[PDB]
Design an enzyme around this catalytic site. Structure first.
Site, PDB file in Angstrom:
ATOM      1  N   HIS B  41       0.815  -1.223   0.000  1.00 11.11           N
ATOM      2  CA  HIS B  41       0.000   0.000   0.000  1.00 11.11           C
ATOM      3  C   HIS B  41       0.863   1.296   0.000  1.00 11.11           C
ATOM      4  O   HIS B  41       0.296   2.387  -0.072  1.00 11.11           O
ATOM      5  CB  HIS B  41      -1.093   0.019   1.081  1.00 11.11           C
ATOM      6  CG  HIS B  41      -0.598   0.198   2.478  1.00 11.11           C
ATOM      7  ND1 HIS B  41      -0.604  -0.849   3.376  1.00 11.11           N
ATOM      8  CD2 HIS B  41      -0.146   1.307   3.103  1.00 11.11           C
ATOM      9  CE1 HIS B  41      -0.139  -0.354   4.509  1.00 11.11           C
ATOM     10  NE2 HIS B  41       0.163   0.936   4.389  1.00 11.11           N
ATOM     11  N   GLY B 143       2.526   5.944   9.787  1.00 11.31           N
ATOM     12  CA  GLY B 143       3.948   5.916   9.488  1.00 11.31           C
ATOM     13  C   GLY B 143       4.626   4.646   9.979  1.00 11.31           C
ATOM     14  O   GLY B 143       5.749   4.352   9.546  1.00 11.31           O
ATOM     15  N   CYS B 145       3.662   1.519   9.423  1.00 10.41           N
ATOM     16  CA  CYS B 145       3.551   0.415   8.462  1.00 10.41           C
ATOM     17  C   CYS B 145       4.914  -0.022   7.966  1.00 10.41           C
ATOM     18  O   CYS B 145       5.807   0.799   7.798  1.00 10.41           O
ATOM     19  CB  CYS B 145       2.630   0.781   7.309  1.00 10.41           C
ATOM     20  SG  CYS B 145       0.984   1.290   7.833  1.00 10.41           S
TER      21      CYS B 145
HETATM   22  C1  LIG Z   1      -3.021   5.104  11.031  1.00 13.53           C
HETATM   23  C2  LIG Z   1      -2.352   3.799  11.383  1.00 13.53           C
HETATM   24  C3  LIG Z   1      -2.129   3.457  12.714  1.00 13.53           C
HETATM   25  C4  LIG Z   1      -1.529   2.250  13.018  1.00 13.53           C
HETATM   26  N1  LIG Z   1      -1.132   1.370  12.094  1.00 13.53           N
HETATM   27  C5  LIG Z   1      -1.322   1.699  10.812  1.00 13.53           C
HETATM   28  C6  LIG Z   1      -1.940   2.881  10.399  1.00 13.53           C
HETATM   29  N2  LIG Z   1      -2.243   3.122   9.034  1.00 13.53           N
HETATM   30  C7  LIG Z   1      -3.212   2.424   8.402  1.00 13.53           C
HETATM   31  O1  LIG Z   1      -3.860   1.546   8.948  1.00 13.53           O
HETATM   32  C8  LIG Z   1      -3.483   2.823   6.964  1.00 13.53           C
HETATM   33  C9  LIG Z   1      -4.473   1.866   6.336  1.00 13.53           C
HETATM   34  C10 LIG Z   1      -4.019   0.844   5.514  1.00 13.53           C
HETATM   35  C11 LIG Z   1      -4.901  -0.120   5.075  1.00 13.53           C
HETATM   36 CL1  LIG Z   1      -4.294  -1.435   4.108  1.00 13.53          CL
HETATM   37  C12 LIG Z   1      -6.241  -0.102   5.424  1.00 13.53           C
HETATM   38  C13 LIG Z   1      -6.702   0.913   6.264  1.00 13.53           C
HETATM   39  N3  LIG Z   1      -8.055   0.838   6.766  1.00 13.53           N
HETATM   40  S1  LIG Z   1      -8.808   1.693   7.945  1.00 13.53           S
HETATM   41  N4  LIG Z   1      -7.833   1.637   9.232  1.00 13.53           N
HETATM   42  O2  LIG Z   1     -10.026   1.066   8.339  1.00 13.53           O
HETATM   43  O3  LIG Z   1      -8.837   3.047   7.500  1.00 13.53           O
HETATM   44  C14 LIG Z   1      -5.822   1.909   6.684  1.00 13.53           C
END
Ligand SMILES: Cc1ccncc1NC(=O)Cc1cc(Cl)cc(NS(N)(=O)=O)c1
Ligand SMILES: Cc1ccncc1NC(=O)Cc1cc(Cl)cc(NS(N)(=O)=O)c1
Lengths: 304, 304
Positions: B41, B143, B145
């Protein structure tokens, strides 16, 4: 999302660990520049530990009696000295892996990471706090002496703890990197009682703010209190008295969440007076006190 | 003495972290040999995340569109490919800091350390477990990821997790290093419910043995049970069913303490049926399930 007991990345410290052997005793040493730091009880036999005269024991030791091994290679010892409860072994080679560092003596309530080591080899890393009775609740076995506690600010490692002993109660005591023990402990095999282990109030409040930021809000109430009223409750529950200095340090958390420090104190007062009623906060069924307000800001903001 | 939630020393993994930028998205990458691994992603815009066709999005990207920075220096990308939900960026230089490593896909119940990173820089290390619903309860912000989970056996790092996303419930989902998600999760911004998060019974039993070894014994009772009787209790409390495989893995702990596995199960049954009555075990007021039997043996023996 989420809140964990997080330790600093240990790489900078792993590159400083060495094995020190004197006679038949082996423990860990910290190699920074051309000096190896280790607990002075490396010169003791089990028979010496009951009432050791370190100055007299050290007279019988020469530079060649200190065997310092960094990984698989042997370091040449060209000088030795005792500074309080630590030995400083001058070696002929500077550690190429020496990070930018400082030696700091922490206050009770402050947290740090510990890199547990055996025979100069790292086994694990965990976060803990210097308790108000100057003990640490670590995880250490025989051979772990000389393992260190530290904090990291960007590229600088601040070493604050060197492990020396376990008390008969299974709690841990040690020194700063100048060899001065935290608390009244002495490096002698004599029963030494620890003192009352009170709860670090400012840290519990910080952790309650961390809980609100991450969604755990059930404990927020419609009440407020005063510093003197809260402190009456804190005294009853063996919590440290909260000062205006503590309130000031919680300022960034109060600003981020919009919850006044005294309102959060009223939440904590009600949790102390009524318990959790089978509920949890941040995966815990007790009030956590080993996160400082700085730790909460760091983790909740992503400081590297 | 003492028992802590201990992570592996993170140094071997810190030396593999890099920053990957594609377009306006920056996340973490893992550089091993001449390949950088990162979540696919990275090629998405926020607008793409709702329903991305990764194959079509990747057509518009060339090697020069992937900016890989290791510390302060830029890596030259000479190839790129997608393997499941991860991108593999071939670089022209092998990572000199590449440790001995393997890629492993863990089972639920297994634990691992996470080195949380932002912009290719490590921020902290913590221990967690792959939950039975294939989520992890981590601590990650935007950030983070591409941060990885791993285990270490002497000198070999076994990478098992790469962080991809947070679910709307604040729990975390990710892939193995072959890019296959743990659980039914997809790398799309669509609400995905996690599933029942049951308690890892074999781990709770391991932790009860750790408690006995370290002196916390108040929960030991005069009773015993059977696997089928214990499992009736485990079902009622959303605990995973205990099998003879689990009993076998607890063998070293049963041997060290002299407490039969079924006797420890009767202790756990009584703790489930009656609660802790305001008491604690290893500093916890709830039953801990993120220590495997191997973790308990390792920590209680001092494996480096
Ligand atoms: C902000 C954050 C915090 C912690 N770990 C990771 C992140 N970032 C993400 O999750 C970005 C992301 C990527 C994918 Cl593949 C799907 C989503 N889906 S959602 N959560 O329902 O909007 C969101
Ligand atoms: C076995 C162990 C476990 C964890 N950490 C450290 C150790 N080792 C030690 O404590 C050795 C040692 C050194 C000193 Cl200076 C005093 C004592 N006094 S005692 N604990 O009451 O016998 C013992």
């Amino acid at each position: 999302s989420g809140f964990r007991k997080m330790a600093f990345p240990s790489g900078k410290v792993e590159g400083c660990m060495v094995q020190v052997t004197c006679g038949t005793t082996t423990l860990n040493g910290l190699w920074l520049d051309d000096v190896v730091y280790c607990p002075r009880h490396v010169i003791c036999t089990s028979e010496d530990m009951l009432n050791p005269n370190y100055e007299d024991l050290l007279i019988r030791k020469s530079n060649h009696n200190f065997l310092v091994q960094a990984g698989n290679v042997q370091l040449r010892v060209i000088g030795h000295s005792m500074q309080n409860c630590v030995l400083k072994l001058k070696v002929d080679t500077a550690n190429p892996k020496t990070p930018k560092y400082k030696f700091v003596r922490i206050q009770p309530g402050q947290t740090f990471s510990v890199l547990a080591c055996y025979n100069g080899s790292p086994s694990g890393v965990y976060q803990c706090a210097m308790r108000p009775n100057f003990t640490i609740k670590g995880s250490f076995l025989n051979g772990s002496c000389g393992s260190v506690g530290f904090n990291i600010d960007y590229d600088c490692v601040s070493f604050c703890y060197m492990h020396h002993m376990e008390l008969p109660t299974g709690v841990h005591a040690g020194t700063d990197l100048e060899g001065n023990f935290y608390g009244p402990f002495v490096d002698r095999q004599t029963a030494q009682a620890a003192g009352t282990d009170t709860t670090i109030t400012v840290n519990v409040l910080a952790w309650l703010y961390a809980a609100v930021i991450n969604g755990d809000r059930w404990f927020l109430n419609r009440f407020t209190t005063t510093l003197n009223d809260f402190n009456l409750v804190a005294m009853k529950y063996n919590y440290e008295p909260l000062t205006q200095d503590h309130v000031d340090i919680l300022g960034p958390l109060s600003a981020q969440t919009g919850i006044a420090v005294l309102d959060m104190c009223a939440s904590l007062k009600e949790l102390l007076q009524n318990g959790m009623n089978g509920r949890t906060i941040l995966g815990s069924a007790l009030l956590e006190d080993e996160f400082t307000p700085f730790d909460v800001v760091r983790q909740c903001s992503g400081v590297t």
